[PDB]
């Protein structure tokens, strides 16, 4: 029972990773698993994407200033 | 948005070709000599708006400006059945009836003198155009007005509309300054035009004599052939297809890019209307074979045995009842048989578009085809022009009238630069026979 | 077609067949052979013959010489001797397996049968070579 | 506290600096995170398929929609993750801008 | 409760057990066909016992066939002269099968200075208006105004400026009364073939861009040849790719669009029955489907085509970047002249171009080699003839 549930959960996570790969989303495994858990537990995907984009833009601005 | 094309008719030849082009468009669209749509043309399959503007009275008016330095022809046009087609306010004629005197430099100086009126006309037509695609200049390279004023207008259009295509209908000669006019015009076509359709009067005369059995073909008949070619050039506009419906794409396919803009023409059928060709169903393969026949090419290219000339690109607009499967089979057979030699340094561009004819134009042929081809043997014409220029320059021939004009009063350095540009063009055409041509000039 | 009346098409096909002289033509599908034949057709006066669409190209498992020898050696003591025979020692066959067949719909399918079709194919290949 | 720890953990590894050093970035993140507390994604199969098809066409791919369709089945095998559509929309949004 | 697309197909059904033994299968089928034709003429066209058992095997089938023929002929006439069935066929040929030369390449020619520009300032409504304007001067004046209203185009929108070569697809539909001649699946397959021919046209457009650039810019500027070495290193590979992709374009635009469109046009031209025109549409669809070679079972051909497209796109992008850099450098040199380091940097920029063009040439050679091997080793003689024609191209 529990082993089957864990197998189903891991199959779903692997399928989500594969779908992100085929979509070329460019989302890493840890970030994808965090965003998936955030959406399962209840959070606005719009807000999460906006925060991720703001953080990535700050990172790229720091990298450009480094260059 | 409309896709307007402004026609600039320069000198006798340019104005006559523009007049015959507008006549052909009227005949294809069912428009009366006054510009009014004929009752039989209410259900037309073409919207005049592409090349003509529509007046408030449902009159279709050509977006054509006719410029001549001599009153005789303008007065004959205003006394012609087509006088009502053109807007009289869109016709500028220099009151100084002195002309350019068959001098390219004088024609250029005159274009400079009439710059404001001409660029005002071009801007008026552009603003009356929702999405003006470009300008088609119909001129001769050997005269004064059509060469000089045409080059001036090409320069000013390239400067003001650097994103718009410049197509030319350039009449090649069969005037002691003719080599100078020809060299200057070839220079300006090479540097400031996106596409030059070469209309060789020698080849047109040869075709008129050999194929129509016309003893001494008149200029009127040559201009009728030119207008037929111009109609075939606009045939791809009238039938909605999937590709290359604009002058930018036409120029890029035929003049094979803007610097390689010397275009050879081909027309089919080349037969007098009196030649009722017996009951032979013209096949796609027969069409392509006739276009590939040297006797059906409307440009006199030298059979130089030294240069292995090749086709850079070919676009065939086939108008009429054409089976696309027969078009495909004809292209396949042409490739397998290598019936045409293509550039080795670039992809073989052979396109075939099938379109329907205008319901208003009588077609004796259920299927016709025009080929516009950029082919390195066109270089033989530029080489001939260069040899004529060098023959005149070594003799300082016909320079006395040039020295009267300010551009040539001190020296001929602009002539020498034009000769250099034409030499570079010749060398690039020779490179186009070689697989490294793509890298030859750069 | 089979009797090569108006053989200018066969003269044109000689040059296409000459590019294939190493291996028998049966090693290559007949679709491109028929495409070459039809692209040669429209260059010759053949419009007034609405019966060449019933012609098809068959790839025989044996060349003209070999098949002829086996036909003239079967039900005879020659089959044993020429069972080892090959066209490499003789003229090489790269275009002698091309043949014409006439597939026609019923009830005209009753007129033409494979017993006659084999003789047609052999005769046409011999004439063509 | 979860949004705060999420943002700090994301900024400490994705960026070489924390977004508390630039208060504009921190303020923007904290004002973006708290707008709504429920996912706002398209939960229809038709809309998900349309988004995937448009993404693949803008990617110049016209044969991987079957792969995305098959992968979303493996995702929907359990039938206990109702925001898989939410994460697919998140990936769509993160991939649409550069494409 | 039958849609307007199936008033002749499934407006009425057949009951196998409910057919007598004196009436055959084709007899019942023709009876159903005649009844469906009559109902369709009523609904959508809006214009104009012992003996029966015995005559079943003498002339009842002939009467049924004649009635079905006449009803189908009248329905086809009404649809053609009322709902513009032939006009809709010609529209779908022109818009989703490249039957009259204008469309996608002209839109690319117009948008080439604009496609690189951001698509956040360019939206599908402006291009829809441009298409509507330019289709009137085209053959679409033959199409009904509702047809031009139902015809649009999808293009780059909402982008900072990037590739738009592979995003261009005409979408076409027919009205309700005329949609019994052209079914839903028919229009869907027309759209699919339009997308395929759009990919093909984008590949051909990249090839033509390369060709026109290397035919013209060579004769548009005369400068030092020390930079021409890396140009030749790039352009040998670029010309091999040009010839390959022109061969592909000539093969595909001939064996995919043209044959199907000609067969459909000939069948419709001789078609006097709705079943006849439906079969013509189905044959066109099948011919377009057959040569796609993009299905799952054609994974090798699909990957080879994707690799060829990516190679063409990369070559075009690198050629454009090289041309931009050379233009900048030579403009700076001309400004300096008008007003040694410039020449030194212009020469130093050449070796990197040569190395990267050697790498690109090697990759293109490898990919073309694998594609030719896949074509030749296959049991389809069409691919072997394509490989033979490619070798005849004097590039391989």
Alpha-carbon gap, residue C101 to C123, rounded angstroms? 11
- Nearest C-alpha in E relative to C26: E381
- Tokens at residue B40, please? 């039989």
Alpha-carbon gap, residue B187 to E343, rounded angstroms? 28
Using DSSP bridges, classify how beta strands B134-140 and B165-172 pair: parallel, antiparallel or unpaired: parallel
Query: In terms of DSSP H, where are the helices of B128-172?
Result: 150-160
Q: How far is CA B105 from CA B8, B70, B157, B418, B424, in A?
A: 19, 18, 19, 12, 22
Alpha-carbon gap, residue B417 to B91, rounded angstroms? 33
Residue E337: which residues within 8 A CB-CB, separation 6 or more?
A: none
* Chain B hits for C39, Cβ within 8 Å: 285, 329, 332-333, 336-337
The Cβ of residue E381 has, within 10 Å, a number of other Cβ atoms equal to 17
Alpha-carbon gap, residue C61 to C75, rounded angstroms? 20
CB–CB of B322/B363 below 8 Å?
Answer: no
Chain D touched by A38 (CB under 8 Å): yes
DSSP B384: H
Final resolution, Å: 4.3
* Chain D hits for E294, Cβ within 8 Å: 62-63
What is the Cβ-side half-sphere exposure of residue B165, based on CA atoms within 13 angstroms? 31
Query: In terms of DSSP H, where are the helices of E97-173?
Result: 103-115, 124-136, 145-149
Alpha-carbon gap, residue B239 to E94, rounded angstroms? 8
Alpha-carbon gap, residue E333 to E203, rounded angstroms? 35
CB–CB of E37/E67 below 8 Å?
Answer: no
Q: How far is CA E180 from CA E44, E85, E282, in A?
A: 10, 9, 14
What is the distance between the terminal CA atoms of chain D, rounded to a whole angstrom?
34
CB–CB of E289/E256 below 8 Å?
Answer: no
How much helix, strand and coil, in percent to the nearest 5, is found in chain C? 45, 5, 50
Sign of CA dihedral E383, E385, E387, E390: negative
Chain B touched by E232 (CB under 8 Å): yes
CB–CB of E257/E97 below 8 Å?
Answer: yes
Cross-strand bridge partners of residue B368: B319
Cross-chain residue pair B281–C47, CB shorter than 8 Å: yes
- Tokens at residue B29, please? 């669209």
Cross-chain residue pair D39–A39, CB shorter than 8 Å: yes
Cross-chain residue pair E294–D63, CB shorter than 8 Å: yes
The residue among B136, B148, B74 whose CA lies nearest residue B111 is B148
Q: Report the residue from A9, A55, A66 with minimal CB separation from D11.
A: A55
Residue C79: which residues within 8 A CB-CB, separation 6 or more?
A: C70, C73
- Nearest C-alpha in B relative to E228: B442
Cis link prior to C126 (omega < 30° from 0)? no
* Chain D hits for E163, Cβ within 8 Å: 60
CB–CB of D52/D96 below 8 Å?
Answer: no
The Cβ of residue E354 has, within 10 Å, a number of other Cβ atoms equal to 16
Residue D52: which residues within 8 A CB-CB, separation 6 or more?
A: A23, D65, D68, D69, D92
List subunits contacting chain B, requiring 3 or more Cβ pairs under 8 Å: C, E
* Per-residue burial over B76-87, b = 16 or more CB atoms within 10 Å of its CB, e = otherwise: ebeeeebebbbb
Alpha-carbon gap, residue E123 to E116, rounded angstroms? 14
Cross-strand bridge partners of residue E336: none
Cross-chain residue pair D41–A45, CB shorter than 8 Å: yes
Alpha-carbon gap, residue E179 to A23, rounded angstroms? 36
Alpha-carbon gap, residue C42 to B364, rounded angstroms? 22
- Tokens at residue B285, please? 């393969």
List subunits contacting chain A, requiring 3 or more Cβ pairs under 8 Å: D
The residue among B161, B171, B127 whose CA lies nearest residue B9 is B171
Cross-chain residue pair E163–D60, CB shorter than 8 Å: yes
The residue among E196, E198, E191 whose CA lies nearest residue E105 is E198
Residue E51: which residues within 8 A CB-CB, separation 6 or more?
A: none
Chain A touched by D17 (CB under 8 Å): yes
Chain E touched by D57 (CB under 8 Å): yes
- Tokens at residue B45, please? 């399959």
What is the Cβ-side half-sphere exposure of residue B3, based on CA atoms within 13 angstroms? 27
For tokens 């006549």, the residue is: B23
Cross-chain residue pair A26–D41, CB shorter than 8 Å: no
CB–CB of E244/E393 below 8 Å?
Answer: yes
Q: Residue A18, exposed/middle/buried by CB under 10 A (0-12, 13-18, 19+)?
A: middle
Distance of CA D8 to the CA centre of its chain: 19
Residue B199: which residues within 8 A CB-CB, separation 6 or more?
A: B169, B170, B171, B172, B226, B229, B265, B298
Cross-chain residue pair C32–E382, CB shorter than 8 Å: yes
CB–CB of C127/C77 below 8 Å?
Answer: no
- Tokens at residue B323, please? 């089976």
Give SS3 for B58.
coil
Report D:40-99 residues touching A (Cβ under 8 A): 40-41, 52, 55-56, 59, 64, 67-68, 71-78, 80-84, 86-95, 97, 99
Q: Residue C19, exposed/middle/buried by CB under 10 A (0-12, 13-18, 19+)?
A: exposed
Cross-chain residue pair D94–A11, CB shorter than 8 Å: no
The structure was resolved experimentally with cryo-EM
Q: How far is CA E278 from CA E44, E86, E180, E182, in A?
A: 17, 12, 9, 8
Helix or strand run (H / E) with residue B313: strand B311-320
Alpha-carbon gap, residue E376 to E368, rounded angstroms? 12
Alpha-carbon gap, residue D63 to E296, rounded angstroms? 8
What CA dihedral angle connects E188, E192, E195 and E201, to 10 degrees?
-120
Alpha-carbon gap, residue B391 to C66, rounded angstroms? 71
Report E:279-308 residues touching D (Cβ under 8 A): 294, 296, 302
> How close, in Å, is residue B228 to chain C by CA atoms?
28
Helix or strand run (H / E) with residue E154: strand E152-154
Alpha-carbon gap, residue A43 to D3, rounded angstroms? 10
- Nearest C-alpha in D relative to A12: D75
Q: Residue B372, exposed/middle/buried by CB under 10 A (0-12, 13-18, 19+)?
A: buried
Residue D2: which residues within 8 A CB-CB, separation 6 or more?
A: none
What is the distance between the terminal CA atoms of chain E, rounded to a whole angstrom?
61
């Amino acid at each position: 029972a529990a082993a089957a549930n864990l197998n189903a959960v891991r199959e779903t996570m692997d399928v989500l990773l594969e779908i992100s790969r085929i979509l070329n989303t460019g989302l890493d495994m840890e970030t994808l698993s965090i965003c998936v858990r955030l959406c399962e537990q209840g959070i606005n995907p719009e807000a999460l994407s906006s925060v991720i984009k703001e953080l990535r833009k700050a990172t790229e601005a720091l990298k450009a200033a480094e260059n | 948005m409309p896709r307007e094309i402004i026609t600039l008719q320069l000198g006798q030849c340019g104005n006559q070709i523009g007049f015959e082009f507008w006549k052909q468009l009227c005949a294809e669209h069912g428009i009366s000599p006054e510009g009014i749509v004929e009752e039989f043309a209410t259900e037309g399959t073409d919207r005049k708006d592409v090349f003509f503007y529509q007046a408030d009275d449902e009159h279709y008016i050509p977006r054509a400006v006719l410029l001549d330095l001599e009153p005789r022809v303008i007065h004959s046009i205003l006394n012609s059945p087509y006088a009502k087609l053109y807007n009289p306010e869109n016709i500028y004629l220099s009151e100084h009836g002195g002309g350019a005197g068959n001098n390219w430099a004088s024609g250029f100086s005159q274009g400079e003198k009439i710059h404001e009126d001409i660029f005002d006309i071009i801007d008026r037509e552009a603003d009356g155009s929702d999405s003006l695609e470009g300008f088609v200049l119909c001129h001769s390279i050997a005269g004064g007005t059509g060469s000089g004023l045409g080059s001036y207008l090409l320069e000013r259009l390239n400067d003001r509309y650097p994103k718009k295509l410049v197509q030319t209908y350039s009449v090649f000669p069969n005037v002691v300054v003719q080599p100078y006019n020809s060299l200057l015009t070839l220079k300006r076509l090479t540097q400031n035009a996106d596409c030059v359709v070469v209309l060789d009067n020698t080849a047109l005369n040869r075709i008129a004599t050999d194929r129509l059995h016309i003893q001494n073909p008149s200029f009127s008949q040559i201009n009728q052939l030119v207008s037929t070619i111009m109609s075939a050039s606009t045939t791809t506009l009238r039938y909605p297809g999937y590709m290359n419906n604009d002058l930018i794409g036409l120029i890029a396919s035929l003049i094979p890019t803007p610097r390689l803009h010397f275009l050879m023409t081909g027309y089919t059928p080349l037969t007098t209307d009196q030649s009722v060709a017996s009951v032979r169903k013209t096949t796609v393969l027969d069409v392509m074979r006739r276009l590939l026949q040297p006797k059906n090419v409307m440009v006199s290219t030298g059979r130089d045995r030294q240069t292995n000339h090749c086709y850079i690109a070919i676009l065939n607009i086939i108008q009429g009842e054409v089976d696309p499967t027969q078009v495909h089979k004809s292209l396949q057979r042409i490739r397998e048989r290598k019936l045409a030699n293509f550039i080795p340094w670039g992809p073989a561009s052979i396109q075939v578009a099938l379109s329907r004819k205008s319901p208003y134009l009588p077609s004796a042929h259920r299927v016709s085809g025009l080929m516009m081809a950029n082919h390195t043997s066109i270089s033989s014409l530029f080489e001939s022009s260069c040899q004529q220029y060098d023959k005149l320059r070594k003799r300082e021939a016909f320079l006395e009238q040039f020295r009267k004009e300010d551009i040539f009063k001190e020296n001929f350095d602009e002539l020498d630069r034009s000769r250099e540009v034409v030499q570079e063009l010749i060398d690039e055409y020779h490179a186009a026979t070689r697989p490294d041509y793509i890298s030859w000039g750069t | 077609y089979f009797l090569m009346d108006q053989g200018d098409f066969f003269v044109h096909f000689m040059d296409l067949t000459e590019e294939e002289l190493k291996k028998p033509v049966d090693d290559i599908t007949p679709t491109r052979l028929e495409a070459l034949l039809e692209l040669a057709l429209r260059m010759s006066t053949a419009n007034t013959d609405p019966f060449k669409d019933d012609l098809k190209i068959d790839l025989m498992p044996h060349d003209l010489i070999t098949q002829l020898l086996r036909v003239l050696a079967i039900e005879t003591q020659q089959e044993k001797a020429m069972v080892h025979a090959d066209p490499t020692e003789l003229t090489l066959s790269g275009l002698e397996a091309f043949s014409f067949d006439y597939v026609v719909t019923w009830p005209l399918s009753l007129i033409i049968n494979r017993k006659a079709l084999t003789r047609y194919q052999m005769l046409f290949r011999h004439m063509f070579y | 506290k979860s949004p705060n720890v999420l943002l700090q953990n994301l900024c400490c590894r994705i960026l070489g600096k924390s977004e508390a050093d630039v208060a504009q970035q921190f303020q923007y993140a904290v004002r973006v995170i708290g707008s709504n507390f429920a996912p706002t994604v398209e939960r229809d199969e038709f809309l998900v398929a349309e988004k995937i098809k448009k993404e693949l066409t803008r990617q110049r791919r016209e044969a991987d929609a079957a792969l995305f369709s098959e992968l979303h089945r493996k995702l929907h095998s359990q039938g206990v993750l109702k925001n898989k559509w939410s994460i697919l929309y998140l990936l769509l949004s993160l991939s649409e801008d550069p494409r | 409760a039958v849609k307007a697309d199936r008033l002749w197909h499934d407006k009425y059904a057949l009951r196998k057990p409910m057919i007598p033994s004196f009436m055959t299968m084709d007899q019942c089928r023709k009876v159903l066909l005649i009844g469906k034709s009559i109902n369709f003429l009523h609904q959508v066209c809006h214009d104009q016992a012992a003996d029966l058992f015995t005559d079943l095997e003498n002339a009842f089938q002939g009467k049924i066939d004649a009635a079905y023929f006449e009803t189908s002929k009248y329905l086809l006439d009404v649809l053609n002269k009322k709902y513009s069935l032939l006009d809709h066929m010609q529209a779908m040929r022109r818009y989703l099968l490249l039957g009259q030369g204008d469309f996608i390449r002209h839109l690319m020619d117009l948008l080439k200075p604009e496609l690189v520009r951001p698509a956040t300032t360019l939206y599908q409504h402006n291009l829809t208006g441009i298409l509507e304007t330019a289709v009137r001067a085209t053959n679409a004046q033959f199409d009904s105004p509702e047809i031009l209203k139902r015809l649009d185009v999808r293009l780059l929108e909402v982008s900072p400026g990037d590739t738009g070569w592979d995003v261009f697809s005409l979408d076409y539909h027919v009205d309700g009364p005329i949609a019994t001649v052209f079914t839903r699946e028919c229009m869907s397959h027309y759209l699919r073939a339009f997308n395929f021919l759009w990919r093909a046209k984008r590949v051909e457009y990249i090839l033509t861009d390369i060709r026109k650039g290397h035919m013209c810019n060579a004769r548009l500027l005369r400068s030092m040849p020390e930079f021409s070495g890396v140009l030749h290193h790039c352009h040998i590979l670029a010309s091999e790719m040009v010839h390959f992709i022109h061969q592909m374009q000539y093969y595909v635009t001939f064996e995919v669009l043209e044959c199907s469109w000609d067969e459909l046009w000939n069948r419709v031209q001789r078609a006097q029955d709705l079943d006849h025109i439906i079969a013509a549409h189905e044959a066109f669809l099948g011919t377009v489907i057959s040569r796609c070679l993009l299905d799952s079972d054609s994974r090798a051909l699909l990957n080879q085509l994707r690799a060829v497209f990516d190679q063409i796109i990369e070559l075009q992008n690198t050629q454009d970047a090289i041309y931009r850099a050379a233009l900048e450098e030579l403009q700076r040199r001309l400004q300096f002249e008008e007003k040694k380091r410039r020449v030194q940097e212009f020469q130093e920029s050449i070796p990197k171009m040569c190395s990267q063009l050697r790498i690109l040439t090697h990759f293109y050679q490898g990919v073309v080699q694998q594609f030719l091997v896949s074509l030749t080793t296959s049991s389809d003689e069409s691919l072997r003839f394509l490989s033979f024609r490619l070798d005849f191209n004097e590039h391989y």
